Amino acid sequence: ATFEIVNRCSYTVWAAASKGDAALDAGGRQLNSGESWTINVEPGTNGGKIWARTDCYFDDSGSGICKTGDCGGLLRCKRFGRPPTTLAEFSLNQYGKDYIDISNIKGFNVPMNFSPTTRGCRGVRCAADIVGQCPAKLKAPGGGCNDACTVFQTSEYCCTTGKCGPTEYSRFFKRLCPDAFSYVLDKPTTVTCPGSSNYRVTFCPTA
Template identity: 55%
Template structure:
């Protein structure tokens, strides 16, 4: 058996996962931030986590294109309807789809090429809270922890700033220069500004 884990920045929002021999996964999502985080998962739903609380999430073998992220400053009523400042997913506590940027993403896919499991932290949807993602045990020794603990919100360029987070330039400008969906693309001025902070998230 092997174990995976994730974490979010200086105040940490931690995600721990356990892989069985069948490659199903159990994620232990822990909020180590000093504030409340509304954890979200696709697949999986959502859960309010006060500081130091955790949520156990079981995921089927073969799951792919999956995401786990943290939502901030949420307000839900008794029926689970409401809104979040960052990472909102359709105004519901129990997410059915992906979150609205900006939100730091933990991504994973199970039983993929060569029957391997893959995981990463992505800023493709921007950044809202720090994260760490790591195996608690890796039989092959090849699965290593990854984290994004840089203060990206504090260093976010003015055009990308938003309440509670920092947008990806593509989300804001929606141009080929920043989205790079066709052909080769070069670095931009915003890339150079963010490069130092993002490099600390590898």
Template identity: 60%
Template sequence: MMSFRNISMYYFVCVAVHGITLADAATFSIQNNCPYTVWAAAAPGGGRQLDHGQVWDLNVSSGVGGARIWARTGCEFNESGQGKCQTGDCGGLLQCQGYGLPPNTLAEYTLNQFDGMDFFDISLVDGFNVPMEFSPTSGGCNRGIKCTSP
């Protein structure tokens, strides 16, 4: 694996995550390219509603291990951020404080781990709810991964 700090991810080959290098951190730019609204979620990081074409820049500290980003679908939240999602729900909260419930397609990553390297993958261990692409955009690594169907 090569070290990277700029990351791109596409949910539903609809939500895109692009990374930007910071001193001791990475920024994941999560973009919804889906023709419908998704509620992007991250642990650590929280969550946000993304209509088609919208972007959420998520800043993550270096040294993060076991982190996930996923899309939730069919969500309804009230003004205080309480609600429910059909897929990927995380305790009925807009601002996730833990992992989402299956089914949800996962982008997983660890930063600055063994020999300072970063690692990333797409996992269907929790099922499949949206196609996704995950790609680094810096550090010499320019080949991403994608999962368009289960």
């Protein structure tokens, strides 16, 4: 499957793509404002994620640090990134269907649209000013708005026992972005697409 990753933000981001134990395609790349990066993702890929990283510094060896979404200090991510990270999540070719969603379960750093470029389903978007409106206790100094599990590490926020309800903090993310997961047991906002669809992930879709 083909994913085109487009940075419409006015600032540089470092895109990342991983399935947790391996990179997807090159795993990461710098995207200046307006740049597009096309990657190929193997059919059948389960649990893939794409995200943006902000304020990164890398040396010639591709080692460094980012203020949001850092994946063990690598330009080319093999594993998932450090919150806060708005997440585009996908599982491909699962019994004939693709499943896509956007998640704020690991917080929010950059607004995002995640849409198919082929026919058969709708896209999803989280483009509200979540960083600007972020509750004081969830604000990340490096930038971004953390989720409550990352900040407080309780069974209720992290849904450790498999039973948890919405919280004041999850309702904040849900109020601003109804179409994104706001906590682990949120009513699913997953979209079902035809198997082997192609996609575009746009950072800062309105700006």
